[PDB]
């Protein structure tokens, strides 16, 4: 109980910043996460015995893929931590508990292939879940891990609070389906602009949590240029593998996934920053002012991609 996690001075300082990189030492990631749970939630939120067993079962059910891996899980959770810490008073005890656990679990058992590839392959998961295929799978896997003996980190919630937090984690994980993001942000954009946005309305909170999940999920574009640039290699390595597998099914993939069209990556990044990233962190900054540093970092990285195209790197 009186057992805190402590990080070295540089990590203790930099972990509080939105652009923190969790580093290349896999064995430190679990303690980094427990550290974030303790500061954000409390040392009491979770039985440390059961949290540590949950954290390790989650790690084991992430696969060895270039990008949708255990590092990504902890990275997305760190971005959620940074939002929760800069927005102390806006979130319930149940929301802070749920959202860190949601972020850690959001891509469980990812195989490194989009919903689109599962559908055309006619993968069994596409038969069980017609929309948000992988995201319904990630939540399924989260529930299964919570039901292993000794792994129910929520066991000291009342029946109602337990049902509330699983509902938070389910909407949070489904919202990481980027297909659902455009709609969610347009609605949040209208609601903010006509002044009808109301954080006491549960359906409004759900939308705002959804956008936080998209913001944390995309946080690779909010890092310092060299992390952003080196993460892009891992992102495209999965995409080009999927593109290869599309060709094996006799389907020309979209250029984003065609390793023969690497030359168009910088121009594709521009579209993506302009179409998804900048709009995402703009509406987030409007609803939650202290998350501005994510919008600033995103715009710096847009400028770095403009320079790549202009040949200056």
Ligand X SMILES: COc1c(C)nc(CSc2nc3cc4c(cc3[nH]2)OCO4)c(C)c1C
**Which amino acids are annotated catalytic?**
68
Which of 151, 133, 143, 148 lies closest to 170, judged by CA? Answer: 143
d(CA 194, CA 190): 6
Contact 184, 214 (CB under 8 A): yes
Contact 46, 40 (CB under 8 A): no
Binding mask 14-53 for Mg ion (x = CB under 5 A): ----------------------------------------
Tokens of 301: 């990285």
Q: How far is the CB of 270 from ligand X (least distance, A)?
A: 9
> Coil, strand, or helix at residue 46?
coil
Is residue 269 annotated as involved in ligand binding?
A: yes
Is residue 68 annotated as involved in ligand binding?
A: yes
> Coil, strand, or helix at residue 92?
coil
DSSP 274: I
d(CA 269, CA 205): 30
Helix (H) or strand (E) holding 210: helix 202-217
Could you say whether residue 177 binds Zn ion (CB under 5 A)?
A: no
Distance of alpha carbon 291 from the chain centroid: 15
Q: How far is the CB of 66 from Zn ion (least distance, A)?
A: 13
Beta strands in the chain, from DSSP E residues, in sequence order: none
Closest-by-Cβ residue to Mg ion is: 107
Contact 100, 154 (CB under 8 A): no
Is residue 138 annotated as involved in ligand binding?
A: no
Compute φ and ψ for 264, nearest 5 degrees.
-90, 10
Q: Which is nearer to Zn ion, 107 or 238 (by Cβ)?
A: 107
Which of 9, 25, 32 lies closest to 82, judged by CA? Answer: 32
Q: Which is nearer to ligand X, 264 or 313 (by Cβ)?
A: 264
> Coil, strand, or helix at residue 101?
helix
Is residue 217 annotated as involved in ligand binding?
A: yes
Is residue 72 annotated as involved in ligand binding?
A: yes
Closest-by-Cβ residue to ligand X is: 268
- Burial of residue 212 (CB within 10 Å: 0-12, 13-18, 19+) is buried
Q: Name which position in 51, 54, 107, 288 contacts Zn ion (CB under 5 A).
A: 107
Q: Which is nearer to Mg ion, 107 or 242 (by Cβ)?
A: 107
Applying CB under 5 A, the site for Mg ion has a residue count of: 2
Q: Name which position in 40, 176, 222, 228 contacts Mg ion (CB under 5 A).
A: 176
Q: Which does 218 bind (CB under 5 to 8 A by kind): Zn ion, ligand X, Mg ion, none?
A: ligand X
Q: Which does 244 bind (CB under 5 to 8 A by kind): ligand X, Mg ion, Zn ion, none?
A: none
Which of 239, 189, 238 lies closest to 210, judged by CA? Answer: 189
Is residue 204 annotated as involved in ligand binding?
A: no
Stretch of residues binding Mg ion (CB under 5 A), selected from 41-49, 103-111, 199-207, 273-281: 103-111
Binding mask 205-244 for Zn ion (x = CB under 5 A): ------------x---------------------------
Q: Name which position in 20, 73, 107, 142 contacts Mg ion (CB under 5 A).
A: 107
Binding site for ligand X (CB under 6 A): 218, 220-221, 232, 235, 255-256, 261, 264-265, 268-269, 271-272
The full length of the chain comes to: 313
Annotated binding-site members for a divalent metal cation: 72, 106-107, 217
Which residue positions form the known binding site for 3',5'-cyclic AMP?
A: 68, 269
- The residue ranges that bind Mg ion (CB under 5 A) are 107, 176
Residues of this chain that interact with Zn ion (CB under 5 A) are 107, 217
Q: Residues annotated in the binding site, as ranges? A: 68, 72, 106-107, 217, 269
């Amino acid at each position: 109980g009186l057992m805190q996690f402590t990080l070295p001075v540089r990590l203790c300082k930099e972990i509080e910043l939105f652009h923190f990189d969790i580093g290349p030492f896999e064995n430190m990631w679990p303690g980094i996460f427990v550290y974030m749970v303790h500061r954000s939630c409390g040392t009491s939120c979770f039985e440390l015995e059961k949290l540590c067993r949950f954290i390790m079962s989650v790690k084991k059910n992430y696969r060895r893929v270039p990008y949708h891996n255990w590092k990504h899980a902890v990275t997305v959770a760190h971005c959620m931590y940074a939002i929760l810490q800069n927005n102390h008073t806006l979130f319930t005890d149940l929301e802070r508990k749920g959202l860190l656990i949601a972020c850690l679990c959001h891509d469980l058992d990812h195989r490194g292939f989009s919903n689109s590839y599962l559908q055309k392959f006619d993968h069994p998961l596409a038969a069980l879940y017609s929309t948000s295929t992988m995201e319904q799978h990630h939540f399924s896997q989260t529930v299964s891990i919570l039901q292993l003996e000794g792994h129910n980190i929520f066991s000291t919630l009342s029946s109602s609070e337990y049902e509330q937090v699983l509902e938070i984690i389910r909407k949070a994980i489904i919202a990481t389906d980027l297909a659902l993001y455009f709609g969610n942000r347009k609605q949040l954009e209208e609601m903010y602009q006509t002044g009808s946005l109301n954080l006491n309305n549960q359906s409004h909170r759900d939308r705002v949590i959804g956008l936080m999940m998209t913001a944390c999920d995309l946080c690779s574009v909010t890092k310092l240029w060299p992390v952003t640039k080196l993460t892009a290699n891992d992102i495209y390595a999965e995409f080009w593998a999927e593109g290869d597998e599309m060709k094996k099914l006799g389907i020309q993939p979209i250029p984003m996934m065609d390793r023969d069209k690497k030359d168009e990556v910088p121009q594709g990044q521009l579209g993506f920053y302009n179409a998804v990233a900048i709009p995402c962190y703009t509406t987030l900054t409007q609803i939650l002012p202290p998350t501005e540093p994510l919008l600033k970092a995103c715009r710096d990285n847009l400028s770095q991609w403009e320079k790549v195209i202009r040949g200056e790197e």
